[PDB]
């Protein structure tokens, strides 16, 4: 019964690479190593900051992406950063979802929100090999934010 064999350990052995090639992505404003993941600050559009989180899901045993968008508005002489909640129609405009799907839900403690790229079929997508699993993944998935990013 196929299913991801990716172990949280194996996933962590591979995170540094995802971090390395994710640096080549010229849109990246920042990249924090966090526990069991990476948190990037990205400039998706010239007024849209992309707060992107890469973590390891324990249900399905695959790497996952949860993010959330921010708009760089300027009040008066002060710079503002505001959380965006767009319609799935609005969202599908600024991204490249294609066959993929994202659901806007709440965070662990229902304080705020995140857009979740559905990860269920993630495995039937990336492939059999547990070797380079995180590479083949990010390579393909990242495309949802930039068709031109070459990993």
């Amino acid at each position: 019964p196929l299913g991801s064999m990716l172990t949280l350990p194996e996933y962590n052995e591979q995170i540094p690479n995802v971090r390395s090639l994710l640096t080549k992505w010229a849109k990246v404003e920042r990249i924090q190593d966090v526990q069991d993941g990476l948190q990037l600050d990205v400039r998706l559009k010239t007024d849209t900051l992309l707060e992107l989180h890469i973590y390891y899901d324990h249900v399905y045993h695959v790497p996952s992406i949860k993010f959330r968008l921010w708009s760089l508005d300027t009040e008066e002489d002060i710079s503002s950063l505001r959380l965006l909640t767009l319609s799935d129609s609005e969202l599908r405009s600024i991204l490249n979802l294609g066959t993929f799907s994202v659901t806007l839900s709440t965070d662990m403690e229902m304080k705020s929100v995140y857009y979740y790229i559905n990860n269920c079929d993630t495995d039937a997508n990336v492939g059999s090999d547990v070797e380079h699993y995180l590479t083949r993944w990010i390579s393909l998935y990242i495309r949802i934010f930039d068709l031109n990013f070459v990993p």
């Binding site: 002489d77 002060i78 710079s79 505001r82 959380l83 304080k111």
Partner: protein
């Protein structure tokens, strides 16, 4: 090299997570000390990053370098918008000036957040500053500088410690205590900057203090950096014995302007 001007790079860059202004409200409904584990092994835009999550309200140590800053929150956009920062930073400076003169050099580095938590429209206005003081009309210049190496036991020694500032008295580091700061060959600093040959504005604090305590001809400081840009410089403090203290220190918001920053949360 030739006597050169000594340029300073801004001390930090703030990164306050949205998870911060929630924790605030949770607490505001039941002035506070903020804490943050300084990441010195990786800067952003060549400067230290002051990170403010939600747990920026509790010490996890007695191992890692924690900075203690202070946040005061206002009730209206009025009490906030109408409160001259210069006096605030100034006063905050003098406190720190004093603390360096009578204790240790580490006690001079700190940050301050003035925030207006408006629950009405669920917007948040804040402004952070990290004090940088010098005696009015003071200027610095490098006499000469050498490239420091961290593969040196002497460096490896500062690294192992859990402080950003220290001294060299015979080849062994030691708490930059007013007393130890009078026979110390040089001061060491885990700079909050990676700009080649340009230390952080916070260096002035080390100078202003180290001087007013143990006046010298020159002052050798060693800026240590996770980077390959570590260097030791012979500094000269000209024209500065003035009694009045001038203190700069506010960060510039995303517009480049010296204003606070807004983290709008209307959706939620």
């Amino acid at each position: 090299m030739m006597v050169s001007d000594l340029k300073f790079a801004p001390s930090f860059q703030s990164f306050v997570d949205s998870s911060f202004f929630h924790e605030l409200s949770r607490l505001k409904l039941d002035e506070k000390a903020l804490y943050t584990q300084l990441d010195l092994n990786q800067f952003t835009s060549n400067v230290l990053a002051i990170s403010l999550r939600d747990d920026s309200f509790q010490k996890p140590d007695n191992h890692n370098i924690i900075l203690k800053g202070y946040l005061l929150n206002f009730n209206t956009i009025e009490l906030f918008k109408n409160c001259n920062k210069i006096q605030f930073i100034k006063e905050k400076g003098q406190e720190l000036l004093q603390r360096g003169l009578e204790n240790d050099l580490n006690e001079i580095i700190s940050f301050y957040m003035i925030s207006f938590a408006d629950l009405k429209k669920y917007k948040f206005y804040y402004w952070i500053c990290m004090p940088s003081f010098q005696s009015d009309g003071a200027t610095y210049q490098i006499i000469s500088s050498k490239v420091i190496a961290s593969d040196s036991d002497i460096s490896v020694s500062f690294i192992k410690q859990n402080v950003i500032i220290a001294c060299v008295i015979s080849g062994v580091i030691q708490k930059a205590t007013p007393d130890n700061l009078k026979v110390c060959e040089k001061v060491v600093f885990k700079d909050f900057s990676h700009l080649k040959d340009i230390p952080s504005a916070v260096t002035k604090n080390i100078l202003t203090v180290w001087s007013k305590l143990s006046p010298r001809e020159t002052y050798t400081i060693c800026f240590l950096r996770s980077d390959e840009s570590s260097f030791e410089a012979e500094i000269i403090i000209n024209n500065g014995n003035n009694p009045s203290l001038k203190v700069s220190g506010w960060e510039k918001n995303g517009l480049g302007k010296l204003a606070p920053k807004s983290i709008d949360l209307s959706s939620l």
